[PDB]
Amino acid sequence: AHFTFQPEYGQTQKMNLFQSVTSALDNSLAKDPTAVIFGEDVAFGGVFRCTVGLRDKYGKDRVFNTPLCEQGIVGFGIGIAVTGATAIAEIQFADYIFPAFDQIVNEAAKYRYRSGDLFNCGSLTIRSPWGCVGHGALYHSQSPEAFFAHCPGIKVVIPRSPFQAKGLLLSCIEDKNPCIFFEPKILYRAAAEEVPIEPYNIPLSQAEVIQEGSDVTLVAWGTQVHVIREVASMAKEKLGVSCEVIDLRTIIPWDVDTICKSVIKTGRLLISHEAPLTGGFASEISSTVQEECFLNLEAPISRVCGYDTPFPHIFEPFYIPDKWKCYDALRKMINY
Amino acid sequence: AHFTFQPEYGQTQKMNLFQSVTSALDNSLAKDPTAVIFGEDVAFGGVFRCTVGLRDKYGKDRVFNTPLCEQGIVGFGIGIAVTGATAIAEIQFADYIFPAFDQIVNEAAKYRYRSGDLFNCGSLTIRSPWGCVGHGALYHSQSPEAFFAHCPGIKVVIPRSPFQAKGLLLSCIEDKNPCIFFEPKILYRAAAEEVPIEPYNIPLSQAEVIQEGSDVTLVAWGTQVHVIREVASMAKEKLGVSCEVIDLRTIIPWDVDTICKSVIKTGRLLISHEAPLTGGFASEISSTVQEECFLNLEAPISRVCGYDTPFPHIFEPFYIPDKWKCYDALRKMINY
Amino acid sequence: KPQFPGASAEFIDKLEFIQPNVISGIPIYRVMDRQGQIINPSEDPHLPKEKVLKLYKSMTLLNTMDRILYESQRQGRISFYMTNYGEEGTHVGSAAALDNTDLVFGQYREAGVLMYRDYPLELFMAQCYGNISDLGKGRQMPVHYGCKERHFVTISSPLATQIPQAVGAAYAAKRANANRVVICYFGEGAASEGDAHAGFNFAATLECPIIFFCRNNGYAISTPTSEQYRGDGIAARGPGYGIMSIRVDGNDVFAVYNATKEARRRAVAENQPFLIEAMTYRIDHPISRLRHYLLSQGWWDEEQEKAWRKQSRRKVMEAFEQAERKPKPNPNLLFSDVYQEMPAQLRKQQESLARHLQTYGEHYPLDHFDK
Amino acid sequence: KPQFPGASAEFIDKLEFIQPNVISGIPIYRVMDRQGQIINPSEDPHLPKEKVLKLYKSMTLLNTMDRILYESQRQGRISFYMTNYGEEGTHVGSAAALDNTDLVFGQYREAGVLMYRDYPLELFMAQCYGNISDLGKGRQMPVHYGCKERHFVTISSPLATQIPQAVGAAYAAKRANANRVVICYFGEGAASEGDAHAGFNFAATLECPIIFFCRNNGYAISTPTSEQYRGDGIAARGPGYGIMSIRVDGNDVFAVYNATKEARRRAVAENQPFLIEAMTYRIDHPISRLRHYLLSQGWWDEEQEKAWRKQSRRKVMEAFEQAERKPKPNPNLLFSDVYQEMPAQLRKQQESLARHLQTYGEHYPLDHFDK
Numbered sequence A, B: 001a002h003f004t005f006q007p008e009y010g011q012t013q014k015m016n017l018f019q020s021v022t023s024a025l026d027n028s029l030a031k032d033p034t035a036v037i038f039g040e041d042v043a044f045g046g047v048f049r050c051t052v053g054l055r056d057k058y059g060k061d062r063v064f065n066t067p068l069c070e071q072g073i074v075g076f077g078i079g080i081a082v083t084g085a086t087a088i089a090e091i092q093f094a095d096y097i098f099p100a101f102d103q104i105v106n107e108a109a110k111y112r113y114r115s116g117d118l119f120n121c122g123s124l125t126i127r128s129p130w131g132c133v134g135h136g137a138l139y140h141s142q143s144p145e146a147f148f149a150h151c152p153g154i155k156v157v158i159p160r161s162p163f164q165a166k167g168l169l170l171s172c173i174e175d176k177n178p179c180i181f182f183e184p185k186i187l188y189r190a191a192a193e194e195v196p197i198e199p200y201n202i203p204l205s206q207a208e209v210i211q212e213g214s215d216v217t218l219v220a221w222g223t224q225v226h227v228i229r230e231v232a233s234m235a236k237e238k239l240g241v242s243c244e245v246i247d248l249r250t251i252i253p254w255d256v257d258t259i260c261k262s263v264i265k266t267g268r269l270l271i272s273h274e275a276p277l278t279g280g281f282a283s284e285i286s287s288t289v290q291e292e293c294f295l296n297l298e299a300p301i302s303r304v305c306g307y308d309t310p311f312p313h314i315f316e317p318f319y320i321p322d323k324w325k326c327y328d329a330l331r332k333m334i335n336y
Numbered sequence C, D: 001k002p003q004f005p006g007a008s009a010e011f012i013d014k015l016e017f018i019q020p021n022v023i024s025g026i027p028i029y030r031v032m033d034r035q036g037q038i039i040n041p042s043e044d045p046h047l048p049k050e051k052v053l054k055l056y057k058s059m060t061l062l063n064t065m066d067r068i069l070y071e072s073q074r075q076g077r078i079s080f081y082m083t084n085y086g087e088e089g090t091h092v093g094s095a096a097a098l099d100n101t102d103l104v105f106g107q108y109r110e111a112g113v114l115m116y117r118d119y120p121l122e123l124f125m126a127q128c129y130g131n132i133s134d135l136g137k138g139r140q141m142p143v144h145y146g147c148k149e150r151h152f153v154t155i156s157s158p159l160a161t162q163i164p165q166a167v168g169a170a171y172a173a174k175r176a177n178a179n180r181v182v183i184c185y186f187g188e189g190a191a192s193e194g195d196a197h198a199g200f201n202f203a204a205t206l207e208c209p210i211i212f213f214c215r216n217n218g219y220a221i222s223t224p225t226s227e228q229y230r231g232d233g234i235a236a237r238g239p240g241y242g243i244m245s246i247r248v249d250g251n252d253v254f255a256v257y258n259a260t261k262e263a264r265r266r267a268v269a270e271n272q273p274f275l276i277e278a279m280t281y282r283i284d285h286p287i288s289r290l291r292h293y294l295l296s297q298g299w300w301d302e303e304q305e306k307a308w309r310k311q312s313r314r315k316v317m318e319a320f321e322q323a324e325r326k327p328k329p330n331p332n333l334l335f336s337d338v339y340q341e342m343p344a345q346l347r348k349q350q351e352s353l354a355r356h357l358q359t360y361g362e363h364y365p366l367d368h369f370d371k
């Protein structure tokens, strides 16, 4: 396994990431009578178990299967949301979100703007499994966030843990804008952590500094946060380097201020993501940090990303931007 | 009008950009008996006249209308290309390419890789009108290249003139990879220029330095090249600043070397595009130039782009990254 | 006896392909002939005189507005225009069969639905001019109308995208226990889009109270229907989805009305979709046919025709002139409503623009825009 | 008489919605009963003994391979697997009706087509293991088979994407004047995708020689067909597109063969699409039914059954063991074939990896990979 997962709101219980999604969804349906959940195979509990029990508890009219048609799932969800009802759509793998790209980019994202706020689909949330899983190859591994980051009017949100997933998913569901929430599927059954039973919110468009540091800033999201945490430990032990480790959380709109403040302090930035380098979201972060922090930069901003290929099957261990790749880039940057 | 268009291969004649497309397409069908052209309303000559006369000359089996279905147009084109026949698909406005996004990103781009080169769709080219047109609003104005730039396995190519359009389109049609060729529609009927009657090629993945300069590098593509040419003239006259003006031409794979060599010389870069700033292709260029030319940079790299909104109707003159916006950013960069 | 969960059927012991019936298609429902006479008394809707006159006047007012705005577009005073010629009867006839609060989705040929619902001439014009009165804030091209008050969802240019959306809205209405229908208008071309298959199928499996209203005028831009499909139009697709379907004469406001009224009644009661395919011409006109009906009842005459022609031209011209001399909205409205709130980085772009205009403002049309 | 270019039809003077016929659907074509007896002599294909035995042995070899690879997946030795249980007859029966050079598009249930076409056990295994023998270079998950030599286009995971592609290939074949068909396999779930509507419609309007072969086994993962569609399966959709359609018993190799053979004959001659919907079970099995047929002709017996069961298990196990002990391909193959050529910036990434492995190579499974 290429990562290690590790670590005020009332009663908690141990939940893995799929359970924390179910808990979010359960709290949502309990408190919002308009809310419905739909998509492929959601009725029996979903292929990743994220909707287990929900149909029995809330009814077949609120937790239901659609035909096998992603453009339809998103269009249908928009339409629910146009009426003001909360629509929680599922796309079975993020890899299969593309048929709905037109409905997401040309419709959902532009609905409010183009109507002068006469109509909206703010009560729509699209959730989908994301990211590499060790053997998923081209169509069970993808990280599509950079495609969506170039579209004004949607929000794109990615958690790193069960506690983060529930609070961020609740925030997406309640946010008054169409949100895509990408669930790192390699984490669904990884380690549990304590998660509040009752609803709570984690703010959108806010990065989280999970470890303070003074020599270099490391930025990632999803599973890759755990990789950069381990990189921070390697750099401390092997190089005496102090790393400030930041989880971006929200891809758009992103927390420019938190990232720039960190880099003003450290003077060095390394951004990492599983998505391919070219056109990846690391380019937006690097460009922006260079614009705001030019005089503070002691070394070129590093991007350690997936290669510019489709996501391979048997070659996955060589493809991913692992801790050794991140560490080596960090080493060279420090020695610049 | 927000721009001014201005300015070895045998006999030439005056052609506007739509005519130069027709000439490319005509040369292609003449010399490649497998080649076919298809899409919405192409038979009568197309909504922008790019296929006038071609059906009468080459036959109804080679220049033909499809049903109104963009996902079908691209899927159908892939299938032609799988057999080795040249398939030249038209998408009526680039704004309407999104229904085909799944066929482009998950299928066309990955066809060769995922089959180990047992199958391919290299003989597919998708051409589509692109860019702002003064009054096109949300769905007749878009510049989608950054969405496609994050997808390994396709090429994305954008010309600035009739001479450039014909040579680049011929290169796309003959290239052994699926290509998207975006035709700046505001140029279709703008000024003519001399275009060779006979086929010729302009290389893909090669930027063109159209004016040498020593103080700053300006990069754009499409219509925006003409804007930056005018900016160069303003900077010379008003500031005594010498600008090196570069047309990127190919978005992916892009000519990193030409851009970096220019910036090593000038030490300053301004990139401009009509597409929204966030996630726009200027971020990839800026990030990369910062990585390769860090020690040569005298000032932060500037991006002068469309705002992070949908493309508005009545507000277009305030939205676009015009010569005054580019000039002012250039002024501040020079004064840094 | 077959035991297959995918279908309910007998065995057959001989090989027989099922043929399409395209030459003898689904017949075209008509109520009145070309001289405006009711053909079959049992099919008379007996709409009251004041409602039928409102049908006529809505159609003719639309036709007057089209003439003027078409000319405005030819002169470049507005940037785009789509007329309603030939579609006046399908739209007013169907709108008249809806409850005022039934939600409408459509695209470019649906202005008559708004006209029937009394949308002000001033607001049709404000959208086309992108002026300060436009509740769309001048952001979309012309004829991209919408009205929250009149339950008419804002039009968008990508064809067929409204179809699965309309189905979602109908599903929500079902749950809310509404006594409400959704109607979704689209052309025969748009029906080729994947989103049409999505919408039709979702509406059937999810049991939604929606009327699909397909306008078949034989063309999509330059494309005749022989290049668009090969079955018996769009009406013949409905049964394959389990959708109750009918074909009607789109030049007959009463045929359209009757089909729409019955579709509405059954959709809302049964929570099941209906498909109406109205056959029209690309432009024996709906306005003329209804006029002959009016004359036959003693409900109209040449003097009334002349006077209304004059009054409607004056009403449209007054709205037109007012619309042209209003300013465009504040350029600040280019940045609002992208999200509900305005993100800080977007506000930063707005501030950039304001600074830019302080310095370079003489190079922009500031005098045409509010504040 | 109506004068509408969109459709060919009479007028009707009464309002009547057209109902779907779902309870009395399109009947299911069958040739042999469950005891393997030909029901109607006129429908006997009289396939020669050696071909029928090849049908049987292809199906049983597939079933043997499935048992072994299913277990391999359960043990985590391969990462993914899709079986063919219940689909052996649809695939071998249809493949046997094709010309060897007819191009096949499909997805996850089509391994039998490859088996009929003599694809080596070694290459099925090489793809599933991603080993050095895999012509796909280990890049796709397991069961994503393809073979240029045997005209079987490489499978991809996104459902229904192959449908409009198959139509394009058929259009190209038409132009090349080929005497070639394309066949395109997909499930009933996949038929819900927008790309299915695209493919069906393009094939009809563009007059393509293609066979659409829909496998209807009543489920798509957990979704029963009651939540997938509401018309009479997928066969009932064909006529709405102008496509000649039939439904067949997928447990009857001869019914499948006969429908496919006739569809092929007519498609190639007439340049028109055909739709075959084969009803199967999610797993009165195709292998058993054909076995009863064989016994009735005196073409097989218990001794032969036992011996072939043993020989096929040995052949599969030999291929399996060989496949497991081969190395995986060179990691350099992660970078080729993205484009035809390798762009310089991609070569730069490849060089980065080689440098990285020189230093950090002990942390990677280098010993499992070639060179």
Ligand SMILES: Cc1ncc(C[n+]2csc(CCOP(=O)(O)OP(=O)(O)O)c2C)c(N)n1
Pocket (backbone or CB within 6 Å): B040, B068, B070, B092, B096, C109, C157, C158, C159, C186, C187, C188, C189, C190, C191, C215, C217, C219, C220, C221
């Ligand atoms: C997705 C998409 N593709 C293409 C277009 C361009 N387009 C605008 S109208 C039209 C024809 C529509 O025909 P139909 O649906 O029959 O409606 P009609 O114009 O005949 O009323 C086309 C292709 C568009 N708006 N959207």
Ligand SMILES: Cc1ncc(C[n+]2csc(CCOP(=O)(O)OP(=O)(O)O)c2C)c(N)n1
Pocket (backbone or CB within 6 Å): A040, A068, A070, A092, A096, D109, D157, D158, D159, D186, D187, D188, D189, D190, D191, D215, D217, D219, D220, D221
């Ligand atoms: C576009 C897309 N969405 C979802 C999936 C996940 N998926 C893999 S198989 C399957 C069910 C397919 O059912 P059907 O087409 O009936 O074929 P069957 O498995 O019954 O043979 C699904 C939803 C996918 N591969 N592609």
Ligand SMILES: [Cl-]
Pocket (backbone or CB within 6 Å): C067, C068, C071
């Ligand atoms: Cl006039």
Ligand SMILES: [Cl-]
Pocket (backbone or CB within 6 Å): C157
């Ligand atoms: Cl349009």
Ligand SMILES: [Cl-]
Pocket (backbone or CB within 6 Å): C363
């Ligand atoms: Cl000026």
Ligand SMILES: [Cl-]
Pocket (backbone or CB within 6 Å): D067, D068, D071
């Ligand atoms: Cl076993």
Ligand SMILES: [Cl-]
Pocket (backbone or CB within 6 Å): D157
């Ligand atoms: Cl899958």
Ligand SMILES: [Cl-]
Pocket (backbone or CB within 6 Å): D363
């Ligand atoms: Cl290790």
Ligand SMILES: [K+]
Pocket (backbone or CB within 6 Å): A122, A123, A124, A125, A172, A173, A174, A175, A176, A177, A178, A179
């Ligand atoms: K939301």
Ligand SMILES: [K+]
Pocket (backbone or CB within 6 Å): B122, B123, B124, B125, B172, B173, B174, B175, B176, B177, B178, B179
């Ligand atoms: K090409």
Ligand SMILES: [K+]
Pocket (backbone or CB within 6 Å): C106, C107, C155, C156, C157, C158, C159, C160, C161, C162
């Ligand atoms: K629309």
Ligand SMILES: [K+]
Pocket (backbone or CB within 6 Å): D106, D107, D155, D156, D157, D158, D159, D160, D161, D162
């Ligand atoms: K596929």
Ligand SMILES: [Mn+2]
Pocket (backbone or CB within 6 Å): C187, C188, C189, C215, C216, C217, C218, C219, C220, C221
């Ligand atoms: Mn039409």
Ligand SMILES: [Mn+2]
Pocket (backbone or CB within 6 Å): D187, D188, D189, D215, D216, D217, D218, D219, D220, D221
């Ligand atoms: Mn199935």
